[PDB]
Design a binder for this molecule. Sequence first.
Ligand code: QBL
Length: 335
Amino acid sequence: KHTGYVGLKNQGATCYMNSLLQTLFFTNQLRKAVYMMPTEGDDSSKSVPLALQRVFYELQHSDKPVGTKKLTKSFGWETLDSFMQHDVQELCRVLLDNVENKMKGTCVEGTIPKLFRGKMVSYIQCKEVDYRSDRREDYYDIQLSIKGKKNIFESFVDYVAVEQLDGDNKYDAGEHGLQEAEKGVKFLTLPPVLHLQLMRFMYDPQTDQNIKINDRFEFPEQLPLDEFLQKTDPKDPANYILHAVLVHSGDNHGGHYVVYLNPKGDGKWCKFDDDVVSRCTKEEAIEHNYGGCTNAYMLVYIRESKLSEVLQAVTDHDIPQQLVERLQEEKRIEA
Ligand SMILES: O=C1CCC(=O)N1Cc1cc2nccc(-c3cc(Cl)cc4c3N(C3CNC3)CCC4)c2s1
């Protein structure tokens, strides 16, 4: 613990979970809200809220590597298969929807959407008939296409690019028949905490297989996103600071997962390799994970205007006495 930070017990079958837990743990405002959840009546093994409270508590207090057994147990993913068949954002939705449900009716209701939810609009516009379809969506995460793209900017460019629906890919416009159309996405808001997964896998139609992309893909320390909003705010530009880089090395049937974090948002990074946390260069965290067998697959950015609120200090006093008492008894039960 000479970095000041403690690790989690060896990933084993749990894959990218440890990576995500450190990422969520250092989303300080989330952690604080998780501690405020009223778990007093919950079961010590089947409540996900309580097991996440306990992991966060141990990450904050333990000098030894922290275990996740009760947490994996609590949501029912106890096999290499359960982790392998899902992606990291699905695990994140599992944890965060469990937590946001428990916060309903409390002083911390709305924490999850406050931090992580943004708003987009999808459209289809017919060019030759007066028909348009609009769909407003919430999103908690973005999946960016990387194949052929050099950087995050070009992925965003591609994400909001307008597609023509013509030829064989005519839009079915109902009573208007098959119609030539455009479709696009536009962002209306970007969240305080921006979760970007990079599409390191895709089905490719020419080869007829799901392909891994191991190409170089560059991501900045500072990400300006005003270009991609439908209306920018001059009082609050969408400027983003890189907080976390989740990385995989090696085999597509196992391999190894690590996360690089700069917890305070200050450009001083550590590598979290399960039980070993170590100081690292910025270059190790960022450039050396660009690729092109060691691939970044998830980036977390925090908005500059929200940085001090999201990464507010947490002290031991910020954990409710009820919960400390519970978790201390639940540690005495372990001896
Ligand atoms: O690529 C796609 C297609 C759909 C999507 O959201 N993505 C983005 C990802 C999210 C995600 N979440 C967790 C782990 C990965 C992942 C990254 C690499 Cl570089 C290699 C291996 C991965 N897994 C993955 C866990 N499932 C396979 C194991 C194989 C090696 C990924 S990749």
